[PDB]
């Protein structure tokens, strides 16, 4: 029935957890970071973080603790998945090969049991005698640690307290004891219990203390020295050691809640505290050396340190360095200084780590303008709020820029016969040549005895016999090095000027109109081996020596003027070996011979921005598999260079492109630069492994980014972005936003910091009177509609909404016969006393210019969660209703029809006269607008209940849905159109567990397509709470089946990190049902195929009947699958 594909375009960036210890080696400080499904391992050092190994798991990491059982050389790792997959991991490294082996594993799920609020707690005993798991209320799961229990057997000790807040094991306890915080009728208390592995019960423990603060939320076991625990709350931080009891109440807390903490000293003394607003604190414990015997805890104080990103995770490394793991904003590496500098902060950020999550909304846009998408998102929240621009391409780091206009070419050069680095850069101009010398980082004019400067150079560089060559329009000059001077020169027999110039280390082929001359480079002499007259004006030349040959090309690639041809010629005799008649109007600009992986090709570029590429046989010289792409519009110049190992071609033009090979398939990658007229590799000591680039006015040296990667441009907002549109005509984006302002005695509400809405250029406030018939300390939400510039992204205009009015939906569009393009917002009057809005409105603005204009207004009796432009009309959902409004000539929106069969219509998507509705709990429904009738008709709905979160239309018959339990699904309109009941239903044909919470779906692609053919159809990108960006397409039953087989084979061979089965992981799953995936294939699995050994590769293919298209079956080879998957990787 259904055939979909799902690949990760961007791995989750939000940090869910981060622990620290000695995992890689007992004498190494490791930093383990949990994204969601990703596990990153580092080594802490001087520079700080050294990436060691990164892996994935088939599940969401919920618990992650390092620990050390007696008898282990280094630490072991504990991990519990959200689907309850448990395991103990060991870091084992033999050679350049690293593996994370499994010492034990099992699924600790219970058949019944209520998942506790405050979720899964996973703690480990200090003695390493056992693991404690609070998975369900009233139950505490225990797992013994005998090197015997590898299947992770466990028992459930009952717990009276049915509502635990937090739990930790205590230190210095002959018997493992649990100290937690709970809440019953009497309030919140904190008791203890001992855990006996023997009897398998829980007795009664050391101490008890009823009624701690009502907001007591964290527990902390203080180490050996002090023993006992600490309890963090709202203004209440207390110590409890049986008989001891301390209690401070720093007003510094009061403001925000302390959510995370970390022990700085192995003994207690210092701890880090994390505020919910980003405040970093320090908790100190004053140790009192009695005089003789033992040591008590005299006192404890709190000290503000500074501001960081809103922290989720907090880990102290060493030498005053701390890693701040964020979920709402970028994560960071911070240094704690002894002295609080200006303003008063010991906190100074070192490194900032991009985080796109949460992604609340997004839109695809061709900003730069030319067939390449780009994602603009509403990421983060609160103070960490922001916009992100995500683009594909290769990046270059500019290292110098000189104002040299008119550069007509440039070549790298070795001035010192002995040194192997470049130290000179030759520049060409209309009629001269200028030689720049390279001193470290300094570049300055210089002369080179043998070279002429009053002529244009067509080529120059190092050649055979410690010689140097310079070919100008006037002649080709051979220059000595150590002796240094002109030691030979060639010129056409009649002084005619050289028109085209090709040249490698030992040979030269220049053209004088139609005349071709083959010369060879020998000591102190240039030898003219031959010559010929081409049937037409020569346009371009290449004699690049390919193959294991030795600097002597047997072939000569030439491009002609008249018949717009590219032809191969045997070098000695200029004998024709192949004449490829191409293009038609424009002549070839550039032509080059090169090798990409193992194969040789011929590239030829027209003045069209058009590029032809053939397979080349360097023996026979015949061109094969003629292909064509469009790299732009200006003529294109081809040049070769070697990034790291391999070698690629740099294509200079208005659309700069790096051409290379992946798995035998060429790759055209766009460079993130404006326009490049000429390029050349430059490898000096000052500019190691670099590129010398040149446009129409400036020289520029920098270095290429190895290979392509999404680049993330970010725009701070300092407040929460909620929705976003794009208005072409206005050249800008419309963004819904909210900020936190607290009530103030001075009549209204102030704020907490400057933000995009406040520090705006223009500004305005709602003047509406439609409605008008907290304490002080309470927080209040204020919404705004920002108008950000497409190019500068500065906030042009900001607009405030009525007090208490939340803006929930946005949309840029035209309506009726109205010529103008408005910005339309849907809202809701939110009062805490109501369970759901009863009032709201649809405001219609316009940014005709300079400022925003409030054109119209329309009252509504509920929240306008979603709205979409619909065939000139405006579709919108209010609460339980779906309404279609018309736009008169009198500029008013007026109801035509409605649909009321919903609990709460949150999401809306349109295609034609069909409409897709996403409801709180009645999953998707399909409506159709009946024109003649003037209202709506229910076509079909999904009869399975589903708490939606996002929705999308893959095509007329298939609808994609994201649900609140991290699952994706597809519903289809039954094909058995033989009954009005069968059409009424839409079968769930696709089920897949994503393990990601989805907020937005939107047709689009971050990949080019103007490049002159896809195994997939469609392209829906999607945003995630973890900052993860995915893609979804459609396959033919053919490909699906192959890939489904592929998966099952691969699963037999891929070593799964925690011994978790891929099929378990991808099984649709909720607190209700659990089913096997179907209709879905994850390309993450399929793409991991290209990363295993041929042996394993050959095993995966073993005994597989494969159809290479020949319709004639054959035994499948690894290369068949390589070709298949390589094609698949190109959809993103």
């Amino acid at each position: 029935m259904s055939y979909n594909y799902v690949v990760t375009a961007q791995k989750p960036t939000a940090v869910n957890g981060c622990v620290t210890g000695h995992f890689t080696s007992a004498e190494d400080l490791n930093l383990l970071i949990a994204k969601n499904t990703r596990l990153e391992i580092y080594v802490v050092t001087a520079e700080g973080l050294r990436p060691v190994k990164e892996v994935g798991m088939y599940g969401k990491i919920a618990v992650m603790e390092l620990f050390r059982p007696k008898g282990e050389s280094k630490d072991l790792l504990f991990i519990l998945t959200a689907k309850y997959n448990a395991c103990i991991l060991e870091y084992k490294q033999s050679g350049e090969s690293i593996d994370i082996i499994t010492r034990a594993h099992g699924n600790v799920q219970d058949r019944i049991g209520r998942p506790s609020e405050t979720g899964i707690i996973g703690i480990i005993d200090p003695e390493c005698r056992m693991i404690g798991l609070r998975l369900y209320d009233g139950l505490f799961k225990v797992i013994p640690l005998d090197r015997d229990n590898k299947e992770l057997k466990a028992f459930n000790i009952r717990l009276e307290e049915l509502h635990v807040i937090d739990v930790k094991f205590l230190y210095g306890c002959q018997a493992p004891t649990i100290c937690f915080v709970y809440q019953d009728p009497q309030g919140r208390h904190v008791k203890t219990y001992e855990v006996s592995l023997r009897e398998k019960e829980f007795n009664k423990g050391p101490w008890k203390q009823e009624n701690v603060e009502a907001e007591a939320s964290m527990v902390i076991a203080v180490p050996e020295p002090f023993g006992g625990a600490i309890i963090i709350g709202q203004e209440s931080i207390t110590y409890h050691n049986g008989d001891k009891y301390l209690a401070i109440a720093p007003p510094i807390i009061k403001q925000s809640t302390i959510v995370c903490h970390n022990r700085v000293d192995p003994n207690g003394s210092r701890y880090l505290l994390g505020d919910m607003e980003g405040r970093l604190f320090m908790l100190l414990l004053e140790k009192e050396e009695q005089m003789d015997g033992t040591v008590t805890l005299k006192d404890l104080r709190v000290e503000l340190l500074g501001e960081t990103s809103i922290a989720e995770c907090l880990t102290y490394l060493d030498n005053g360095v701390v890693f701040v793991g964020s979920r709402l904003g970028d994560s960071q590496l911070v240094k704690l200084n002894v002295d609080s500098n200006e303003q008063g902060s010991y906190v100074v950020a070192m490194e900032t780590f991009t985080n796109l999550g949460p992604i609340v909304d997004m839109c695809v846009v061709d900003l730069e303008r030319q067939g390449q998408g780009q994602l603009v998102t509403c990421s983060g929240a609160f103070k960490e709020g922001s916009l992100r621009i995500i683009r594909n391409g290769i990046g270059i780091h500019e290292h110098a820029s000189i104002d040299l206009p008119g550069i007509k070419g440039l070549w790298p050069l070795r001035s010192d016969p002995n040194r192997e680095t470049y130290d000179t850069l030759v520049l060409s101009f209309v009629g001269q040549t200028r030689v720049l010398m390279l001193n470290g980082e300094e570049v300055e004019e210089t002369e080179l005895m043998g070279f002429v400067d009053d002529q244009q150079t067509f080529f120059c560089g190092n050649v055979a016999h410690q010689q140097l060559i310079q070919i100008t329009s006037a002649s080709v000059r051979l220059v000595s090095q150590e002796p240094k001077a002109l030691v030979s020169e060639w010129k056409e027999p009649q002084a005619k000027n050289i028109s085209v110039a090709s040249c490698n280390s030992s040979q030269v082929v220049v053209a004088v109109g139609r005349a071709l001359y083959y010369l060879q480079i020998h000591p102190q002499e240039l030898r003219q081996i031959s010559h010929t007259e081409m049937e037409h004006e020569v346009a371009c030349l290449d004699i690049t020596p390919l193959g294991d040959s030795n600097g002597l090309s047997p072939l000569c690639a030439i491009g002609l003027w008249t018949d717009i041809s590219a032809r191969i010629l045997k070098l000695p005799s200029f004998e024709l070996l192949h004449k490829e008649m191409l293009g038609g109007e424009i002549i070839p600009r550039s032509i080059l011979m090169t090798t990409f992986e193992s194969s040789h090709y011929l590239l030829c570029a027209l003045g069209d921005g058009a590029l032809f590429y053939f397979g080349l046989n360097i023996e026979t010289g015949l061109l094969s598999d003629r292909k064509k792409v469009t790299l732009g519009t200006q003529p294109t110049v081809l040049r070769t260079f070697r990034s790291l190992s391999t070698t690629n071609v740099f294509a200079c033009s208005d659309r700069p492109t790096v051409i290379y090979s992946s798995n035998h398939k060429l790759v055209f990658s766009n460079v993130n630069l404006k326009e490049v007229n000429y390029m050349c590799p430059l490898n000096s000591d000052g500019y190691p492994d670099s590129l010398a680039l040149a446009n129409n006015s400036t020289l520029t040296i920098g270095t290429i980014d190895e290979i392509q990667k999404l680049h993330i441009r970010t725009v701070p907002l300092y407040e929460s972005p909620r929705k976003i549109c794009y208005q072409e005509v206005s050249q800008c984006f419309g963004v819904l936003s909210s900020r936190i302002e607290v009530q103030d005695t001075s009549g209204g509400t102030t704020a907490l910091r400057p933000s995009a809405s406040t520090q705006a250029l223009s500004s305005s406030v709602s003047s509406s009177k439609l409605f008008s018939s907290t304490s002080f300390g309470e927080e209040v939400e204020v919404h705004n509609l920002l108008i950000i510039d497409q190019h500068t992204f500065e906030v042009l205009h900001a607009h405030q909404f009525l007090q208490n009015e939340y803006a929930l939906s946005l949309v840029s569009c035209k309506l009726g016969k109205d010529p103008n393009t408005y910005f339309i917002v849907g809202t809701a009057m939110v009062y805490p006393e109501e369970a759901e809005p009863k009032q709201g409105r649809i405001v219609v603005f316009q940014y005709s210019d300079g400022k925003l204009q409030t054109v119209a207004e329309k009252e509504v009796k509920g929240a306008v969660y979603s709205m979409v432009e619909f065939n000139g009309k405006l579709l919108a959902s209010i609460n339980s209703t779906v309404r279609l409004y018309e736009w008169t000539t009198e500029k008013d929106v007026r109801t035509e029809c409605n649909h009321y069969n919903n609990i709460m219509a949150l999401y809306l998507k349109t295609k034609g006269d069909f409409i897709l509705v996403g409801d709180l709990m009645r999953s998707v429904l399909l409506l159709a607008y009946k024109p003649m009738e003037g209202n709506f008709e229910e076509i079909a709905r999904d009869f399975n209940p589903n708490w939606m979160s996002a929705v999308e239309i893959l095509d007329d018959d298939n609808f994609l849905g994201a649900e609140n339990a991290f699952n994706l699904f597809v519903c289809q309109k039954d094909s058995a159109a033989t009954t009005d009941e069968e059409r009424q239903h839409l079968q769930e044909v696709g089920l897949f567990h994503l393990g990601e919470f989805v907020n937005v779906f939107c047709h689009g692609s971050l990949v080019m397509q103007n490049l002159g053919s896809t195994p997939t159809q469609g392209s829906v990108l999607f945003g995630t709470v973890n900052g993860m960006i995915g893609l979804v397409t459609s396959l033919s039953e053919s490909w699906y089946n192959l890939l489904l087989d592929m998966q099952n084979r691969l699963n037999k061979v891929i070593k799964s990190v925690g011994k978790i089965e891929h099929s378990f992981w991808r099984s649709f799953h909720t607190e209700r049902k659990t089913e096997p995936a179907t209709g879905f294939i994850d390309g993450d699995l399929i793409e991991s195929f290209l990363d295993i050994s041929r042996p394993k590769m050959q095993e995966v293919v073993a005994n597989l009947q494969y159809d290479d298209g020949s319709g004639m079956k054959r035994e499948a080879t690894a290369d068949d699958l390589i070709k298949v998957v390589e094609e698949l990787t190109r959809i993103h």
């Binding site: 209520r114 709402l328 939340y806 805490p832 609990i903 949150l906 209940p945 339990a965």
Partner: protein, 174 residues
Amino acid sequence: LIETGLNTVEYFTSQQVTGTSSLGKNTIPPGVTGLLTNAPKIAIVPADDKTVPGKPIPNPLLGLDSTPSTQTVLDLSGKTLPSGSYKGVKLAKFGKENLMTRFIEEPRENPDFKRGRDTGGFHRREYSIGWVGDEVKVTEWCNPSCSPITAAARRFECTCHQCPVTCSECERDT
């Protein structure tokens, strides 16, 4: 334990920021009162009151007649589409979970108990809930501010002369 839920939009909002749903929690929606106590905000209430006229509301389960009212059906086990009104479905759950079957909610514009004339001129929303395993049914209707709130569930008439006939919540009821 009983906690007051959170206005939908507050839930809508924060869920796009934090993947956590927040469902699993013994909450009662804001503005609703647990009209059951024979002899948060629950409120103790008299079983009945023959003092004021008014036809009783038939048991929900019995799936009988009550026309000016809205019917809600909720299946705790999933497998069947829920139907009715947001609040109907919300209370149905909170109702099954706690042993409660009567609920009241008086709109914003309204100043213990003594409802009658002083508090008349509007409508007060009632809720009746039935069990039957995993299957939970609810009948919801509108009552005059005039009216008395009791454990018994009837459709009282009006004592005040100001109390209205249809509200904007009383429509589409059948």
